[PDB]
Design a protein around this ligand. Structure first.
Ligand SMILES: [Cu+2]
Ligand SMILES: [Cu+2]
Ligand code: NA
Length: 80
């Protein structure tokens, strides 16, 4: 079958905390980074809603060395 890195690897999510106003590190939202190939990249899919407190839904985009992408939903806990 056709298998990109995104087919091969299975990133898992975890909660991210951040203070209001502060954009957190999307890599922090991947629980099992050690399972993924060297130099795997992490980005937010969308601008995190960090201007006020709340449980903000976000998505970590995992971009593998072959250019394929996985998406991992997480909650950003934004607190003052
Ligand atoms: Cu195959
Ligand atoms: Cu608070
Ligand atoms: Na995957």
């Amino acid at each position: 079958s056709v298998t990109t890195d995104a087919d091969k690897y299975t990133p898992e999510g975890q909660d991210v905390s951040t203070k209001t106003g502060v954009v957190p590190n999307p890599a922090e939202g991947i629980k099992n980074k050690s399972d993924l190939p060297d130099g795997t990249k992490y980005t937010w899919k969308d601008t995190p809603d960090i201007s006020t407190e709340g449980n903000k839904p976000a998505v970590v985009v995992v971009t593998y060395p072959d250019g394929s992408k996985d998406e991992v939903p997480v909650t950003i806990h934004v607190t003052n």
